[PDB]
Amino acid sequence: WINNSWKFNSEEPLITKLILSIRHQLPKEYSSELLCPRKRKTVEANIRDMLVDSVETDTYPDKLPFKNGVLDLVDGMFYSGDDAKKYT
Amino acid sequence: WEPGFISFEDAIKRVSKIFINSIINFNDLDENNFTTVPLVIDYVTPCALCKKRSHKHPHQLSLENGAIRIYKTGNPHSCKVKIVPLDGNKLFNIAQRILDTNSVLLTERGDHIVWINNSWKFNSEEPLITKLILSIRHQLPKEYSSELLCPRKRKTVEANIRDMLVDSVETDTYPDKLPFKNGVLDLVDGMFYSGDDAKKYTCTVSTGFKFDDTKFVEDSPEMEELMNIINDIQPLTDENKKNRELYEKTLSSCLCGATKGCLTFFFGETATGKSTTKRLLKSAIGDLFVETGQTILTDVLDKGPNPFIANMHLKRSVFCSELPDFACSGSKKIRSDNIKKLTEPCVIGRPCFSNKINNRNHATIIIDTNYKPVFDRIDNALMRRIAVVRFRTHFSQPSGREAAENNDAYDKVKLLDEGLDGKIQNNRYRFAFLYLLVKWYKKYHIPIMKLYPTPEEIPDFAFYLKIGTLLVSSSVKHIPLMTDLSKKGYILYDNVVTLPLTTFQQKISKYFNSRLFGHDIESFINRHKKFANVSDEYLQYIFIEDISSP
Amino acid sequence: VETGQTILTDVLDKGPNPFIANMHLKRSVFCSELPDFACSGSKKIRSDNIKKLTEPCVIGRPCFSNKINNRNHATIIIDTNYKPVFDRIDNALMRRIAVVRFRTHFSQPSGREAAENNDAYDKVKLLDEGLDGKIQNNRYRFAFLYLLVKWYKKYHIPIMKLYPTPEEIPDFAF
Amino acid sequence: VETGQTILTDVLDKGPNPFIANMHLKRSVFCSELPDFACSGSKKIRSDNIKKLTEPCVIGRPCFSNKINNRNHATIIIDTNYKPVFDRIDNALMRRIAVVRFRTHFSQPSGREAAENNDAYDKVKLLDEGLDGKIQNNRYRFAFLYLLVKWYKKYHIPIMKLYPTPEEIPDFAF
DNA sequence: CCCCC
């Protein structure tokens, strides 16, 4: 989930892009570890070993995804930010 | 401070750790109170600075050359100065600076493109990011510049640059531009740009050779010589006025970087300037040109892997040769579907076993041949998607000069020069030819670019053009006219004037034959004729001869 | 997504088929300028692929990949100037086609005299040379999206099911 | 470099073709052992397969390789006995062909009378059984090279070009 | 692997 969208790529998994893009969201002492690529690789290895269960994506048949947010079809309230995270 | 050192609270926690004992001014300390306020330490244990039970005086902090020095206040002979440096990953700062200079971009296809030496470059299997990283170190603070001389440091800062780029971009979006290897030439204003002024137009595919304004001039011996060559190639005669205008217009279309709607063929006999035109074009537009086989028109374009279209990507003019002459059986004809989809703005074709299906198409496809091509299918959709150039001049060696004058196809015969081939190998006519091409582009430079088909040149277009001017569909306008239509030979069914098979064929038997055109007639009949009964089968086609008559 | 008429003129499984394995999760791929069957030498449109292209699962793998199951969210619109013919017609093929006709005209002023004397069009209007470049620059992206939203509203039924229209097709006449 | 007759018997594009990708920059290559066309049963030699062997670049790729452009400095010469026959002879093929002829034979003593009285030989001599051993061990390598450079100095005009001589092909009489 | 079939 980088800048309000569920990107996924195969040749370049983006988990290191995410880790570098989430460092402003953690305690201020943590936010300087994530400037060294070796430590981001370590964090990614931990993450990858951490999540076991898989999920189902695009399970709601009536929402349009845009680059900046999901547009609800029934109501019409264009959801942005975290409120679009709920709909993968 | 300077914004690149360290987050303040990180340094504060660092000094709290170094004092190895709770500090009473932990909450009094601010950003301002730096080199004046004393720092009070309640030495519950011996001081870690000097291994004594306590200190006669507190400690004070100083900032110099990126270090926060620790020292005692007074006579610190039995004390030692400690320094903590404030350098927040020098390599991340350099990565940020290179990034903000806007020279590495992530494209929509997943390929990074870097700006080296006044031209956008990219390479899928061998990334060029570190070539740039080394190339640019001259434009950084004179302390950063020597960090990025060790290859491991360059690869670390490249890892950072490739983690910073999350958004993609779009390339080659200005069809009215011509790139080079040193700058982009603006066609609209006749002006050449370089440096940062060329960086904006993200023009990847370049002609591969530098531009020098010393050659893009109106007058030159090269100009007059190449003008004579072009005149001898396509004379400026009135009978060639349409052919010459078409040649000039179809030659400029390769410059514009958008999709083209019609195709142009260089039909012609041997030794008529076809090779000269192709090689002059190659010497002028350089790497924009590409050569590929004739399987595109003959073999299914989808098939499997096919680099013949994978290299069509962004090409602004592609030539193909050696059409497998069709008047004799043995070679698959030029496909109709293959030649219809060469005008969609994104032609479908995948590389040698790769998943990049979509390929952008700015190509003006030209193919050279000695014979009028024949289509397995001719349709209205094809009549709008074909053109042909004819050359009626000969460069002849003196040995065959006598036979040359006895040929009908050679309206003008000259002496072949062995200097043309070598001279166009060294590309002396390159820049003069670009100058005349730019002149022609300005000649037809209205904000719309469009190429129309040429149905008059093809001899295979006669019948489908003929029936348009000789046959009109039966309509309600002709219903109250069946009184005199019955005497002609038509029969009225469900308020439609139809024509039975034999009478229609014998009325056709005065316009075009049944031996040569028999396949055409039978195809038209079994594709267009309707049914009235098992006994009587007719077609709702009315000749204009009976309509015009009273 | 962009594709030609190969999907309607070949076997969809074949071997490695990235051209149909690419529509995984998409909802729009087109079929325009169909390969006219009026002459003998052009393959007709089958009835197995049409039967395949209506299920929640599609069988086919891409290049440089092994997975064969893609989720069908796709809508396809076919268009050609003629009425296509099919090699095989039965009950199954009935529910998998809908057809709409337009008879609207625009052409350059030099072709107006030949424009007004033909029965292939229903109304006489002139050609606009600016709309092509305007839609080339997405001048109608958000607006047409607004229109699409309004049209989704006009049929926003809790259940949505596409339907066929066999009465337009002349193959189904008999 | 040497190669088979697959150059003159099929299409060089197809799939991978190292028989054509290995011609890159070589200055001499031949093709022999032709499928004689006096008896039907083989596809006639492609006439384009002469046109593609004249353009300063040829098309073909190695196995598992991407590059498609190929450089062509080569001299290609055909060595056979029977007059060639082409599927379609036009203005393209006539200038891309010239015939050189051998009017000498060398024979073993056993069959001396057979060749000595043949209308295709203006001379018959003995066959040497020592040339092959000497020539395989590069005896005349530098002597032959010197003779070749002298011949080059014979015709080193500003542009090396070869003139076709169509007077020998019997198919061009019509 | 692409190729082969």
Coordinates of N, CA, C and O in Angstrom, one line a residue, chain A residues 2-3 7 11-18 20-21 23 28-30 32 34-37 40 67, chain B residues 6-7 9-10 13-14 88-89 92 96 106 109-110 112 156 159-160 162-168:
Chain A
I2 N 1.3 1.7 -1.2 CA 2.1 2.9 -1.3 C 1.3 3.9 -1.9 O 0.6 3.7 -2.9
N3 N 1.3 5.1 -1.3 CA 0.6 6.3 -1.7 C -0.8 6.0 -2.2 O -1.2 6.3 -3.4
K7 N -0.3 -1.5 -5.0 CA 0.6 -1.9 -6.0 C 1.2 -3.3 -5.7 O 1.4 -3.7 -4.6
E11 N 9.0 -8.6 -10.6 CA 10.4 -8.4 -10.8 C 11.0 -7.6 -9.7 O 12.2 -7.9 -9.3
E12 N 10.3 -6.5 -9.2 CA 10.8 -5.7 -8.1 C 9.7 -5.7 -7.1 O 8.7 -4.9 -7.1
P13 N 9.7 -6.7 -6.1 CA 8.8 -6.6 -5.0 C 9.1 -5.3 -4.3 O 10.3 -4.8 -4.2
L14 N 8.1 -4.6 -3.8 CA 8.2 -3.2 -3.4 C 8.3 -3.1 -1.9 O 8.3 -2.0 -1.3
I15 N 8.5 -4.2 -1.1 CA 8.5 -4.2 0.3 C 9.6 -3.3 0.8 O 9.4 -2.6 1.9
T16 N 10.7 -3.2 0.1 CA 11.7 -2.2 0.5 C 11.3 -0.8 0.2 O 11.6 0.2 0.9
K17 N 10.6 -0.6 -0.9 CA 10.0 0.8 -1.2 C 9.0 1.1 -0.1 O 9.0 2.3 0.4
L18 N 8.2 0.2 0.4 CA 7.3 0.5 1.5 C 8.1 0.8 2.7 O 7.7 1.8 3.4
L20 N 11.0 2.1 3.1 CA 11.6 3.4 3.1 C 10.5 4.5 3.0 O 10.7 5.7 3.4
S21 N 9.2 4.1 2.7 CA 8.2 5.1 2.6 C 7.3 5.2 3.9 O 6.4 6.0 3.9
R23 N 8.8 5.3 7.1 CA 9.7 5.6 8.2 C 9.3 6.8 9.0 O 9.7 7.0 10.1
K28 N 10.7 8.3 16.5 CA 11.7 9.0 15.9 C 13.1 8.4 16.0 O 14.0 8.7 15.3
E29 N 13.3 7.5 17.0 CA 14.6 6.8 17.1 C 14.7 5.7 16.0 O 15.8 5.5 15.4
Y30 N 13.6 5.0 15.7 CA 13.6 4.0 14.7 C 13.9 4.6 13.3 O 14.6 4.0 12.5
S32 N 15.8 6.3 11.7 CA 17.1 6.4 11.1 C 17.8 5.1 10.8 O 18.8 5.1 10.1
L34 N 16.3 2.9 9.0 CA 15.8 2.6 7.6 C 16.4 3.5 6.6 O 15.7 3.7 5.5
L35 N 17.6 4.0 6.8 CA 18.3 4.7 5.7 C 19.4 3.8 5.2 O 20.1 4.3 4.2
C36 N 19.7 2.6 5.7 CA 20.7 1.7 5.2 C 20.1 0.6 4.5 O 19.2 -0.1 5.1
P37 N 20.4 0.3 3.2 CA 19.8 -0.8 2.5 C 19.9 -2.1 3.1 O 18.9 -2.9 3.1
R40 N 17.1 -2.5 5.6 CA 15.8 -2.6 5.0 C 15.7 -4.1 4.5 O 14.6 -4.6 4.5
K67 N -6.4 5.8 -9.1 CA -5.0 5.9 -8.5 C -5.0 6.6 -7.1 O -4.2 6.2 -6.3
Chain B
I6 N 21.0 15.0 11.6 CA 20.4 14.0 12.4 C 19.2 14.6 13.1 O 19.2 15.8 13.4
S7 N 18.2 13.8 13.3 CA 17.0 14.2 14.1 C 17.5 14.5 15.5 O 18.2 13.8 16.1
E9 N 16.3 14.7 18.6 CA 16.0 13.8 19.7 C 16.9 12.5 19.6 O 17.2 11.9 20.6
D10 N 17.3 12.1 18.4 CA 18.3 11.0 18.3 C 19.6 11.4 18.9 O 20.2 10.6 19.7
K13 N 19.1 11.4 22.7 CA 19.2 10.1 23.3 C 20.7 9.6 23.2 O 21.1 8.8 24.2
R14 N 21.4 9.9 22.2 CA 22.8 9.5 22.1 C 23.6 10.1 23.3 O 24.4 9.4 23.9
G88 N 24.0 11.9 9.0 CA 22.9 11.0 8.8 C 23.0 10.3 7.5 O 22.2 10.6 6.6
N89 N 23.8 9.3 7.4 CA 23.9 8.4 6.2 C 24.2 9.3 5.0 O 23.4 9.5 4.2
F92 N 22.7 8.4 1.9 CA 21.3 8.7 1.7 C 21.2 10.2 1.3 O 20.3 10.5 0.4
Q96 N 19.5 11.4 -2.2 CA 18.5 12.4 -2.3 C 18.9 13.5 -3.3 O 18.0 14.0 -4.0
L106 N 11.5 6.5 -13.6 CA 11.0 5.1 -13.7 C 9.9 5.2 -14.7 O 8.9 5.9 -14.6
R109 N 7.1 0.9 -18.2 CA 7.4 -0.4 -18.5 C 8.3 -1.1 -17.5 O 8.5 -2.3 -17.6
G110 N 8.7 -0.4 -16.5 CA 9.6 -0.9 -15.5 C 11.1 -0.7 -15.8 O 11.9 -1.2 -15.1
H112 N 14.3 2.0 -15.9 CA 14.8 3.3 -15.5 C 15.5 3.9 -16.7 O 16.1 3.2 -17.5
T156 N 25.5 1.2 -3.3 CA 24.7 1.5 -2.2 C 23.8 2.7 -2.5 O 22.5 2.6 -2.3
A159 N 21.1 1.6 -4.8 CA 20.0 0.9 -4.1 C 19.0 1.9 -3.5 O 17.8 1.8 -3.5
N160 N 19.6 3.0 -2.9 CA 18.7 4.1 -2.4 C 17.9 4.8 -3.5 O 16.7 4.9 -3.4
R162 N 16.9 3.6 -6.2 CA 15.9 2.7 -6.8 C 14.8 2.4 -5.7 O 13.8 1.9 -6.1
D163 N 15.1 2.7 -4.5 CA 14.0 2.7 -3.5 C 13.2 4.0 -3.4 O 12.1 4.0 -2.9
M164 N 13.7 5.1 -3.9 CA 13.0 6.3 -3.8 C 12.0 6.5 -4.9 O 11.0 7.3 -4.7
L165 N 12.1 5.8 -6.0 CA 11.3 6.0 -7.2 C 10.1 5.1 -7.1 O 10.2 3.9 -7.4
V166 N 8.9 5.7 -6.8 CA 7.7 4.9 -6.7 C 6.7 5.2 -7.8 O 6.0 4.2 -8.3
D167 N 6.7 6.4 -8.4 CA 5.8 6.7 -9.4 C 6.5 6.6 -10.8 O 7.6 6.9 -11.0
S168 N 5.7 6.1 -11.8 CA 6.1 6.0 -13.1 C 5.8 7.3 -13.9 O 5.2 8.2 -13.4

